[PDB]
Amino acid sequence: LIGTRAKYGGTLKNEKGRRHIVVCGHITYESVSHFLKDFLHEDREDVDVEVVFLHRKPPDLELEGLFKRHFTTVEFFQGTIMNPIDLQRVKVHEADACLVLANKYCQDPDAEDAANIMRVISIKNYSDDIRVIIQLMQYHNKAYLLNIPSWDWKQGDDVICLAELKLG
Amino acid sequence: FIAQSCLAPGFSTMMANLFAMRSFKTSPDMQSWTNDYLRGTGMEMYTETLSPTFIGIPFAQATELCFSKLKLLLLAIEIKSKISINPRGAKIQANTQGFFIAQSADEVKRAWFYCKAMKYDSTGMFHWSPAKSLEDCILDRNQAAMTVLNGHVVVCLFADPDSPLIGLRNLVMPLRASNFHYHELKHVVIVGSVDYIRREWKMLQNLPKISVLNGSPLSRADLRAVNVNLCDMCCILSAKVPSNDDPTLADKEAILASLNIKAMTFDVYGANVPMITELVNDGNVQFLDQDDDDDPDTELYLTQPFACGTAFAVSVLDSLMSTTYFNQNALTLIRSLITGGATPELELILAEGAGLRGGYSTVESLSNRDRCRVGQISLYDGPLAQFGECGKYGDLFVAALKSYGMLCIGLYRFRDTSASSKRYVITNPPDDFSLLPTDQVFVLMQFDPG
Amino acid sequence: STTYFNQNALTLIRSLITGGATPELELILAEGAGLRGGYSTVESLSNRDRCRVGQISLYDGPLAQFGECGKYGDLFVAALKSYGMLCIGLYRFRDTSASSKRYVITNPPDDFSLLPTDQVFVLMQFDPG
Ligand SMILES: [Ca+2]
Ligand SMILES: [Ca+2]
Ligand SMILES: [Mg+2]
């Protein structure tokens, strides 16, 4: 009943002249490790951008070890993007961009797309001038995002449609 | 409540707050519009026996005297027994029970301690039609595009063919009350799956001016066909069962439909389209508006979308059962106010199972058409526009009562006076309240034959 | 990850693989009425002039001379001047001695040796007529 104190919680510490991005959605060991290998590659330009991960379920032992090896550049927080309190904790309004990972191996692509679309609505509700990049499963769900009043491709909002790209 | 909001936007917020018991005390410093709205939320409805001094005077003089002297709003009385809302030329009898809007039950005690020192149905309360079939009411995009639809009501329906039935008749009948002339009746167009509406057509056969458009309200092509930019009110309702996977995903379709219309552009923006949305989860009201601060444990009635008459939920109706126990007549007044008049005899006929039954108009049947109705007026122009320039609620209330018998209940005032077209509800402002030229007044207007 | 660092990178991919999908086209599709036709105008026929993904063979033709000797740099320059085609890579047989399987070589060096049975990925211009 006493249990253990919440290992992942609290607010992200603010730093002067610091750039960070928020990554949400399908946060697993395989998805995070693959994303971090591509994001932090010494073949590309050196930029001081740290990744902040937000997820509901606590990470397993494998994921916790991965975060330890990237202690100086990767931060994890427990919470949901649909909670305005959790958006304040990760400082979404100060983030360079928000990335919404998708579960490509999902039983219902429509259900997965609906959940991710609501995440974009929650982020845009908190603030309108935040760049959002979201992985989409089906093309017919792209119309919903385009009809959002705060969605603007000019400002950097992008939709990565797996169905459109794969069949292309 | 949704149907009454079509005639007067924001009425659902005003009525819902009336029967939720809240205690209001002035805060030290906060937003001026929040303070004005919070004062209105503290008003409830109370029943008190009228003083013997009121015996022998008409209702219009009785409610005017209560407002000016006792600072109480009297809107209905009990006549031996039926309840009349803002009656015209009705005298006050001995021990007459009156309905008052006041901050608490201690205020209404001032009233007692006062001294000088085939066109219509069988009941004749609703319009009737000779059972039009559903097939004749089905329109496609081309049919809806080439017909004029101005000032109509669009019902955006999200429902699977196997979804549980909602009371779609309970939304159209208040719009088909005998208080409205046939020419001023608002056309109702339902956008949704015909398979679901087919099960609901049994109670909609005899209601005039009903159109059904197959498709989904999310598509912009269907919305442009029915001219949502010219509609008087767009209602978004969902009859689908909740998957219970996540509370934040329960209102995904309703939120998306609301946002789609807001970003719509017509050759006039879609953000000016009056919209009402019902939420199966009151915590999803944070996504309805963008220019506000959302906090999870804030009550629904304190949120900006609810204060503006944009959102609605069934959680605000939980206080009705406590109200009903203390005063049975309180529930009768609510039902007569929002259903357009639903006498117990009408419910007996409906309980038979033959649907709405018409009747031949008689001498008294046309007299049932003479009753007050919920309406909204604007102070921008007209004989009452003089009070908007200077600004005094007490002067406007008295002048409207004498000139036409209209009873002012509250105000629909712009949130910002400097630039968003959002208006919030102020219920029963004090007589010293300052009006504005861009203010709208909730009124109970009498029936004018002709 | 690529899209975040450069938004224009995703734009290049979409224009390369979708045949050209302007944001205005997506707006029309989002309405729900499907693909909408239009009457050809002066500029509308000028939108047809853009590069497309194609494959060519060195077995025969004016460019077949480079296949016999073999030099990627010489083939790249000659194709660019003669027709404006830009060579991206090669489609070369896995075994040169017997299976009809070809693998992809992306941007080989200019000193790479070609073969008569080599196929070249090119971006060929639009030729009216
Ligand atoms: Ca109170
Ligand atoms: Ca909000
Ligand atoms: Mg109250």
Numbering used by the authors:
A (entry chain D): 339 to 506
B (entry chain B): 507 to 586, 594 to 630, 778 to 927, 959 to 1109, 1114 to 1145
C (entry chain D): 1013 to 1109, 1114 to 1145
Show sentences the authors wrote.
Therefore, we heterologously expressed and purified Slo from Drosophila melanogaster (Dm) and determined cryo-EM structures of the channel in the Ca2+-bound and Ca2+-free state. The high resolution of the reconstructions, 2.4 and 2.7 Å, respectively, allowed us to build atomic models of the channel with high accuracy also on the side chain level, which is important for in-silico drug screening. Expectedly, the structures are very similar to those of the human and Aplysia homologs, confirming that the overall architecture of the channel and the gating mechanism are conserved between metazoans. Ca2+ ion binding to the gating ring locks the RCK1 N-lobes in an outward-facing conformation. This rearrangement is transferred into the pore domain via the linker between helix S6 and the RCK1 N-lobe, and the C-terminal end of S6 adopts a kinked conformation. As a consequence, the entry to the central cavity is wide and hydrophobic patches along its walls are buried and K+ ions can access the selectivity filter and be translocated to the extracellular space. The binding of Ca2+ to a total of eight binding sites leads to an expansion of the gating ring. As it is directly connected to the pore domain via a short linker, this conformational change also causes the TMD S6 helix lining the central cavity to adopt a different, active conformation which allows easy access of K+ to the selectivity filter. Two potential binding sites in the gating ring were only identified in the Ca2+-bound active state as they are lined by residues of the moving RCK1-lobe on the one side, and either residues of the same subunit or the respective neighboring subunit. The most promising binding pocket which was only identified in Drosophila Slo is located on the RCK2 domain with additional contributions from RCK1. This pocket, termed RCK2 pocket, changes its shape upon the Ca2+-induced rearrangement of the gating ring.
